[PDB]
Amino acid sequence: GYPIPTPHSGQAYDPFADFTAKWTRANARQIKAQSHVPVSPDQNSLPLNLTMPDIPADFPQTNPDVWVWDTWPLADVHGNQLSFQGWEVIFSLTADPHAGYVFDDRHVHARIGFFYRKAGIPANQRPIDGGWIYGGHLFPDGSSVKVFGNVPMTQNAEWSGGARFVKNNNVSLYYTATSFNRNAQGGNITPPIAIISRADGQIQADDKHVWFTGFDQHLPLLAPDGKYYQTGQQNEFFSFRDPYVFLDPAHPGKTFMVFEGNTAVQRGSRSCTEADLGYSPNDPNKEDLNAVMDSGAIYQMANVGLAVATNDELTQWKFLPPILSGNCVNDQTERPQIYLKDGKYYLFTISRRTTYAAGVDGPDGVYGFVGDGIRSDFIPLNGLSGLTLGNPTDLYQPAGAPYALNPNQNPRTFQSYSHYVMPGGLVESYIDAIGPRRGGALAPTVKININGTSTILDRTYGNAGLGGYGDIPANLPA
């Protein structure tokens, strides 16, 4: 019934070289191949080892005054999570739950906030909610939007990136600034503008609180080129965001960045090739290329981009060819991260069931690939499928939506999103929808065992796999 997965070597290339690993239809079709029809009253089709445990429906809010979603720690370029003066510090996308707009209209209102808590306390000794103290907006009002200059706009938002502890500034925040020009119906009057940007500030603390100064000067670093990375002009619905800045010890003088993009094509272009399908000419379960494009799969054109700093100050950056594409497979490979383990390079990226191309299916959650370098013939994890950890999902019934759950679907198919892989394979995420309840709160922290080309969610960790709500611990003092 199911096709032979596209094989991959994991072989490393020069980071500057023109080679892009393909997350192929033959690979992605492995996810449903590995699935089982759920046995009532169970509603999960995924392998148990690739399934996030059920989050309790009585979960606490991270903060009752703030919607919280995509979250990152205070870090260095190695990926270490740092306490500062005996505090743990996190940064979150933030919105107001009592301001007129509904949770799914969060995005255009997003402000980067910070939270803090005393370090060196085991999760099970903290308050159930993780004990995060909300410090407020990280950036001064009006500082971020200066990055767009004098352009027509109705909204601007601060989206995800990273905080690097490093001019008696000591924190560089890499994030995505986005500008919208929308009619009241949410229609684009002009295409959204998405600029990966940097703001530097100073973290300070005493015994009572953490606070920040600076972040007045926002530097535009990268906008899509329309050669490697799709622009608003090519596709008003383009994705360009989620900078992950890191050091590769294979390239000691360099600073790199992975990010979410789309394959740089005009929307509706019949641009998919045999290499995106990834079949043996002899596979009896192979697809026809034109048939795949006719099914509308040409609207799913995810890539993970790579950029390299061109000055010592990391204020100037250059695009390199994309390191992964999911053309005719999925439109979204979000929050890409490079995770170094056992001398290997893991690319983790988050994706959605509802952004899969026709004829391909998989859950919301974390996808993973392993290689010998940051530019590899990346090996999709777990039976050459790419699935690392999915929300419990029946792939034999419709997806529905977090704002309108299909009754025949697992009510936790949207339970978590924006999974971030921390040192020692701990995974931090936010709650979207659990049955009728919307989250905007941090999920229980979870643990994946990363073993070569496969992964197991650790059901010995915390309570049957679930650790503390919003448990984002520092491994090193700053």
Contact call for residues 478 and 164 (beta carbons, < 8 A):
no
Q: Convert 156-173 to b/e letters by CB count within 10 Å (16 or more is b).
A: bbbbbbbbbbeeebbbbb
Question: Which of helix, strand or coil describes residue 81?
Answer: strand
Give first-to-last CA distance, the chain, whole Å.
Answer: 54
User: What does the buried/exposed string (b/e) look like for 289-298 if buried means 16 or more CB atoms within 10 Å of the residue's CB?
Assistant: beebbebebb
Q: Of the candidates 327, 318, 380, 320, which has an alpha carbon nearest to the alpha carbon of residue 349? A: 380
Tokens 């925040």, residue?
Answer: 173
Four-CA torsion 229, 377, 258, 247, nearest 10 degrees: -150
| Euclidean distance between CA atoms 367 and 332, whole angstroms | 11
Closest by CA to 114, choosing from 140, 87, 133, 128, is 133
- What would the two tokens of residue 349 be? 């990226």
Of 227, 139, 141, 150, the residue nearest 193 (C-alpha): 150
Cβ(431)–Cβ(67) below 8 Å = no
Q: Does the active-site annotation cover 334? A: yes
Select which of 54, 70, 158, 361 is catalytic.
70
The one catalytic residue in 260, 334, 428, 471 is 334
The domain tally of the chain equals 1
Count of CB atoms situated within 10 Å of the CB of 147: 21
Residue whose C-alpha is closest to residue 369's, from 28, 61, 16: 28
Phi, then psi, of 137 in degrees rounded to 5: -65, 135
- Dist CA 66 CA 50 (whole Å): 31
Are the C-beta atoms of 347 and 258 separated by less than 8 Å?
yes
DSSP string of 113-146, one letter each residue:
EEEEEESS--GGGS-TT--PEEEEESSPTTTTGG
Tokens coding 174? 């890499």
Token pair, residue 410, equals: 């697992």
**Where is 275: in which H helix or E strand?**
helix 274-277
Rounded Cα–Cα distance for residues 114 and 210 (Å): 9
Rounded distance between C-alpha atoms, residue 256 and residue 304, angstroms = 13
Distance of CA 130 to the CA centre of its chain: 22
**Contacts of residue 224, Cβ cutoff 8 Å, sequence gap at least 6:** 194, 230, 231, 232, 238, 240, 261, 264
- 436 is in which domain, residue-wise? 1-478
For 388, other C-beta atoms within 10 Å of its C-beta total 26
C-alpha 423 chain-centroid distance: 16
CB burial of residue 125 (10 Å; 0-12, 13-18, 19+)? exposed
Return d(Cα 146, Cα 179) in angstroms, integer.
11
Beta bridge partners of 228: none
DSSP 428-473: EEEEEEETTEEEEEEPBPEEEEEETTEEEE-TTSTBTTB--BT---
> Helices marked H in 281-371 — which ranges?
289-294
Break-preceding residues in the chain (C–N over 2.5 Å): 166
What is the torsional sign of CA 209, 214, 216, 217? Answer: negative
Resolution in A: 2.2
